[PDB]
Symmetry: D3
């Protein structure tokens, strides 16, 4: 997993995400929700930024502890355990709290996501920002009901996707499928609950945040109806 | 009005029954009462209806039929805005907006404000009722579209529209083409909301969802429902 | 006399040849003869053609051209119904209905009845020939549609239609918009049938399918064929 | 199987619908399967004779029939309905649920089946079928591939070929399992449009008395994925 | 140039000028299908001499009118002729350009190759040929006939009825304007488009080679989803 | 495609008694029906293994001597002074060359190997009729009792390339992947390419039975001649 080629692997914007976050970090520490294997954390370390990466899954949090011990700048990465819904980190404050590539949408409810957003706000220093990267429903052009599609092709394996979309609950439930020459089959299930921009902004408001800027990606490209994703930056409200 | 699906939904009477069943003997407030498609059927059930409208002229066409209607004394025409809603200490058992009325306010802010005003005009246990297009069931294409609304013997009813899925706005022209060279255009604008969003909006306005149907006959509501009927109570 | 796809299919002559090859130098019957699009090309081949038409006035435009046509005495105009009638002891080698004529009868029953009447007017070995839209090939959307039929320098030919896949009916307006503000509307209705159904209908009427093509030039008929030409015999 | 991968969850509803039409007399189910509808019918005190051509299933019916409280009201019949002789036995209801009628790969075979059903009806008896509604089904021409259902450790997919002329569906229900397991379950259908189906019924000496979208009697329209149709003798 | 939003001409008149100017040297530039000078006049503001070819006289004259009333109007030189039927003598240009589907107004592959060749032969050394063309892939054009909404005004709608032949690669359409009050105006047009790979081969035959391709005159990156493309060609 | 006997008939009816050249002879899909028809076929390849299954079957085939197996590369072929009445490439063979340049070169080489009045024949997928979606797709190709045949592909409408895997899922867990790549061309483009290569289009059909070619045709069969004076 995460060693997959092309579109099967994670978006190749790790470096770009780091630069975007670093530019908002007052040379002070940042908090990544869903740090994963550190696709963004390490590039941030290469820039001299202290990264506290939260991950509810102790399993792969260790692989981070493992890549960090092998990474030239892995000490600037502080592995943290908790829930994006139950973040209790004391009097520690951050200049940036961010959740990349649909992390926020891993919380399977509007309530849970508002709560996560509030928790983020309360962990921000004055002038601090909350940054999220989310799929943009309008640009995704998601069909109603079930679909099946080709994600990526390798010489000896195909990457397919089977998914169920409920446009009411606004949930995506899918399997990433890997068919291998020789009969191998591996299934990687995942669930998302997405939100439309207008909704997401209202959610932020309830959580005491206000939108300050929105882009299509971390390189600050213009965001429009056809953008597959959006990068949103929030500040503490009035 | 116009025939078939060119005219207003034929659920005027069903709407009345649904609202009446929620009327604890006190009066109700219709936002965008129009010509009284629901107001008059409501009078036939012995319910007092205060109907708000900003369209001054169309409000006059209402008074005319009110004097000529057996139960016309039950319809109280009230000019103003779904925003200028300053009706004193008067309180209602039901405040309702039928057939996309709420979505005539071209903004999330304006709609939340309208919802809040509605709440503050409710008596204890009162309910706020809206009928809205359901985006999922509507299957709205991105950008511009053109379609056939209805057919008459001597005219066609067409629609040209622009949909912005970000702003969540519909801007359209109802077009009537008549044999002999007649063309009439009726422009309208909507700003819609998804159920999940609409509910959060209600929350901010101090309302909470109590029930949701596909129509006024209480049919199941699901992803394929073209419309929804939502009932809200005070938080 | 409308250009391109706006007017009737340009296969008038081909239709004649196809029918003639089935005519035992004996007379044929066209249902919905119209202005003789197939009738006159048929006379040029020396085939006696009886033609039925309900429309009294449009049948007159036929008589006019019959007197001015070299072989005009070969076209015999008949007033009556595409349905219930009485043509006496006259029998035909071919009875045919071109370009959706059969589908002008707005019901399965009426169409079976028409088919039966056709059978009973056939001499021994005679054939019943129909040209019908092929639903599979038409790829007809459910509900309402609007599309471009044809373009002229100074006019456009558009179509607004309603499709009910249950009743299997098409109800449309052919629309002509002219530079200068002119609007003309030409309404029509069809009730179509799928091949499998149509064949069962023929069976009930005492007919059996002998051959099916995509057109009058005997091109292979398949799922993508927009139309079909079917030939039936007595059973 | 789970979700949409399994058989429709309306076994209970199908039973009630049939029971309401059964003159407290015995009914005949064509394609009883594992008894998805038969047993619920037994729970309502209705005697169900179940015809089934699949031997792996007819015996499994017997297995559950012995272990079921009301199993004694289910009378299994192994074999092809077209060739089975039921004698002077008559039924109040003959029914075929979930596309059973469309398992006969021809219009002729289906009309014949309908006729056999009519002749086995007592006076005032009814023939009931549940069939996919082509208009609501929105079936694409040619080949298609789609997701049927998702499990934690398996996906349920479908590969199918549709011939809109022959009005046939030929498909494989595919199950991909974590670990490399692949199971294929082929099936074929020959469907009919409502207008056609009704004409077929007429030829078979039946006439339509009512049509619903499902066994709960919801209104049938162009968007209905399925239909439930009830026929009487002429 | 009067119609609003998506109905009017693309609002990139000025950007086009800037892009062409950056490629213009000493000798003038040649616009094929100059129209009302949507790009010509903005080009004069940058001090570039424009020779504008056109065959439509009910519009070439409307150009001269604005040229006399424009501060830098002496920089716009109106010409009557055909993109593939005019010898301009020994005059040479630093840039020859055809904006907004002009090249696709010639209803054939042959006529277009010929136009491209004519353009090449009018280029000074190091001169460039620039075209702006719809990109079929990004355009997502349906087969056969279509009808759609182009734009909305308060008192009128702008509609389009078209016929697309994917074999001949032709578009034949009517821009329709329906006005409150019963007014109907029809504006017919025809295009023959080319795919990028094809267009490049055409340029090769005409003795041109592709030097750069963008999505628009602001040099945005061209990809499969780009509705249009801006292509720059040099002599072989 | 089951039109081999038809591909043979089509080529044969253009060959007369002079020899023909098949590009991408493969396992002899087309060659033998031509041989069974008395036609001499020089077949070209570059992959030596797949050519042996032909040689193997050539010795075991009654008319196996009429099939002459050969080696080289389409764009650059050194076949000496040998000339052919027909040079043909069936089932998207031309589109196996992953570039417009390579394909034009192949077409030129084909022209130069034609005797006077000879013809170049190609069978190609028709983009308009294929209705190919942009980006990635997955579809059902065929069904067996114990296996399904699926397809996963990526389509780049700009490069006009198709990259796919033919997938075979078997009862019991077996999975077999057969990757392939194509670079296709639109008819108008293909014709211009032919012109550059000194060829001109003489006729175009939907298939080898000479059916009508139109926008909806999934494929086309095109015949080219050495361009007019």
């Amino acid at each position: 997993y995460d060693e997959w080629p092309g579109d099967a692997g994670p978006p190749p914007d790790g470096r770009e995400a780091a630069l975007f976050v670093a530019a908002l970090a007052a040379a002070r520490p940042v908090l990544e929700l869903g740090v994963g294997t550190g696709r963004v954390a390490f590039p941030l370390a290469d820039l001299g930024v202290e990264v506290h990466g939260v991950e509810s899954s102790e399993p792969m949090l260790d692989k981070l502890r493992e890549k960090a011990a092998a990474h030239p700048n892995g000490n600037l990465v502080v592995p943290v355990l908790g829930n994006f819904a139950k973040l209790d980190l004391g009097e520690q404050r951050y200049s940036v709290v961010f959740a990349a590539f649909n992390t926020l949408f891993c919380l399977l409810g509007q309530d849970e996501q508002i709560d996560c957003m509030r928790q983020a706000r309360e962990l921000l220093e004055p002038g601090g920002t909350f940054v999220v990267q989310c799929l943009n429903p309008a640009g995704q052009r998601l069909a109603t009901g079930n679909t099946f599609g080709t994600v990526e092709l390798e010489d000896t394996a195909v990457h397919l996707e089977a998914s169920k979309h409920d446009p009411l609950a606004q949930t995506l439930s899918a399997h990433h499928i890997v068919l291998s020459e020789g009969g191998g089959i591996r299934l990687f299930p995942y669930r998302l609950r997405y939100a439309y921009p207008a909704e997401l902004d209202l959610m932020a408001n309830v959580a005491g945040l206000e939108l300050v800027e929105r882009h299509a990606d971390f390189e600050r490209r213009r965001f429009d109806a056809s953008s597959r994703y959006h990068v949103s930056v929030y500040r503490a409200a009035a």
